[PDB]
Amino acid sequence: EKTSSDYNLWKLSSILFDPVSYPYKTDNDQVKMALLKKERHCRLTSWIVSQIGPEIEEKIRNSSNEIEQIFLYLLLNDVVRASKLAIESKNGHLSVLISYLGSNDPRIRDLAELQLQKWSTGGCSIDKNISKIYKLLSGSPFEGLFSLKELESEFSWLCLLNLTLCYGQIDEYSLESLVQSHLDKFSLPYDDPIG
């Protein structure tokens, strides 16, 4: 079946370890090879989102708060539509941060650490989960000052893995080292065959 973990196990392995080649040949072999790994990664990231799908969707349905639905979308690749709900619900603040999804930079890290410090010092302090997001963007959510390790307790080890894999340390890392970094911040359960 295509709902089964058996389907998932054979399918995943070709993407991971074997190249997923291009229809052409690049000008330089470090463009050859770089793009080859990035290709594997691209496909993976969307696939994970489809599997985790129904789960996230369920929670979106059961949440009748605009803001909360907006967060739930970002654990997919529903970036598009996350923005769409935010405008409609009269929330500017959520749209601005959503436009930045799909990229990470030294600049973006800088935003994340400073905005948090100014807020929890000059302010009276931002909410628990907003300060958790700052930790995901600075590049250590689980070892971050607000820890997301509690989020295992609501969302599967594969979703947790998803977070670091799409946003944190994407182009400061190769596809190999990137999954490893997540393990050093939070190990996946051992009883998973596919994990």
């Binding site: 291009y22 229809p23 052409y24 690049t26 000008d27 330089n28 470090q30 463009v31 770089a34 793009l35 990035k38 290709e39 970036v79 598009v80 923005s83 769409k84 405008i87 009269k90 929330n91 500017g92 603040h93 749209s95 601005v96 959503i98 436009s99 930045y100 999804l101 799909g102 990229s103 930079d105 030294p106 600049r107 973006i108 800088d110 935003l111 400073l114 905005q115 100014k118 807020w119 929890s120 010092t121 000059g122 302010g123 009276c124 302090s125 931002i126 909410d127 182009d171 190769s174």
Partner: protein, 436 residues
């Protein structure tokens, strides 16, 4: 403009020397056919003397100040165009397979396509000539501190100003906003991501600079090695299409200040809202529509490489393909002063491409002045206006005509020689007489 007839003559002498020298070089191949060093020196002189006179603060030195500022620009305009005729670029012969970086495609397209290099060049002229006010008088390290103190805000957060109907301000906070938000917007039209990143951090207004940086793309060697030759680290947001359309939707939200929406409108690639746009000059307004053109071409190619997406369009952008003529008309309704002032009109017609035709009507009146059958026109009541139009025409026709026919150019000179007798200069005349 004029100080006194004494100040008017001297402008003629600087210009005349530059023109003769250039003419000799162009007709020898033992000398640089197209020289760029002299016009630059002439440029650097007009420019510096402009600024010194303004800063002195006397009324007589400002009026004269305008005339120097115009002069230095004419030299610059001529420079970019002759760089093109004396060397077209055709760089960035990078890949074109449909799977590579947004940035590898962006460089490759811009340099190959002669049409996009010509739009880029024009924009380089416009950007410079956009005005930036003086430095802000505030660098707050807690924003909204007075409402923080009462605790109606959870923090220094902008959640509340993006949720609030009327936009949560205090009297003190409006006084902070106006100086600050006006400088960041002006700064944005004139760029510099590095400068922006450094300031925003101190003024607890960190987010806006990052929005300005999102235009950027990969410049990482790790990703591709053709974009290893421009930075060693990637930059910006690699979902550009999504960022434009969402920011645009955000721009239209109310319970923002006019500035908040205006800032976002520019960052999303729309013309700013009318309240705010009226304090900016003609040049920058025009410039924004040239942005729309340039990026639409880039994204069409991005679409064939199956990168850019149609789903990322959130609230559509307002398309721009307005002419120079429509642009004069919009600017003129907000302030008729840069689009009903004659010099800025001469500049426009270069762009729209009707300068010989517009010159011709003027040229008929002018020949009469020579014949001494006119002496009550507004170009003989403006000595400076005759001087500008003639010199404009000569410079572009040194190699051969680039926007003004020879006939007209000669005819402007004939009248200008007629005037130069009247101002008591007869040494500049034998220079101009050769081009007839």
């Amino acid at each position: 403009m004029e100080l006194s007839p004494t100040y008017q003559t001297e402008r003629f002498t600087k210009f005349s020397d530059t023109l003769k020298e250039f003419k000799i070089e162009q007709n020898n191949e033992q000398n640089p056919i197209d020289p760029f060093n002299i016009i630059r020196e002439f440029r650097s002189a007009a420019g510096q003397l402009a600024l010194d006179l303004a800063n002195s603060g006397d009324e007589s030195n400002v009026i004269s100040s305008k005339d120097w500022e115009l002069e230095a620009r004419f030299w610059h305009l001529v420079e970019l165009l002759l760089v093109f005729r004396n060397a077209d670029l055709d760089l960035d012969e990078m890949e074109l397979h449909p799977y590579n970086s947004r940035g590898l495609f962006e460089k490759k397209l811009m340099q190959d396509n002669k049409q996009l290099y010509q739009i880029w060049i024009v924009m380089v002229w416009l950007k410079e000539n956009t005005y930036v006010m003086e430095r802000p008088k505030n660098v707050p390290t807690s924003k909204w501190l007075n409402s923080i103190t009462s605790g109606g805000l959870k923090s220094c957060d902008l959640d509340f100003p993006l949720r609030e109907n009327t936009n949560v301000l205090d009297v003190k906070d409006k006084e902070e906003d106006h100086i600050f938000f006006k400088y960041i917007y002006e700064l944005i039209l004139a760029g510099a991501i590095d400068e922006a990143l450094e300031e925003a951090k101190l003024s607890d207004n960190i987010s806006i600079c990052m929005i300005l940086c999102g235009i950027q793309e990969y410049l990482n060697p790790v990703i591709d090695t053709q974009i290893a030759n421009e930075f060693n680290t990637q930059q910006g947001i690699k979902k550009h299409s999504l960022w434009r359309r969402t920011v645009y939707s955000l721009s239209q939200q109310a319970g923002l200040d006019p500035y908040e929406r205006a800032i976002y409108s520019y960052l999303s690639g729309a013309i700013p809202n009318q309240e705010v746009l009226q304090y900016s000059d003609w040049e920058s307004d025009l410039h924004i529509h040239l942005n729309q053109i340039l990026q639409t071409e880039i994204e069409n190619y991005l679409l064939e490489n199956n990168q850019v997406g149609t789903d990322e369009l959130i609230l559509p952008l307002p398309s721009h393909a307005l002419t120079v003529q429509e642009v004069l008309n919009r600017v003129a309704s907000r302030h008729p002063s840069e689009s009903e002032h004659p010099i800025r009109v001469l500049m426009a017609s270069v762009i729209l491409d009707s300068l010989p035709s517009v010159i011709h009507s003027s040229v008929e009146m002018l020949l009469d002045v020579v014949k001494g059958t006119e002496a009550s026109n507004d170009i003989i009541d403006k000595p400076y206006l005759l001087r500008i139009v003639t010199h404009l025409a000569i410079c572009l026709d040194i190699i051969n005509p680039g926007s003004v026919e020879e006939v007209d150019k000669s005819k402007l000179i004939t009248t200008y020689i007629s005037l130069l007798k009247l101002q008591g200069l007869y040494e500049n005349i034998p220079i101009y007489a050769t081009f007839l």
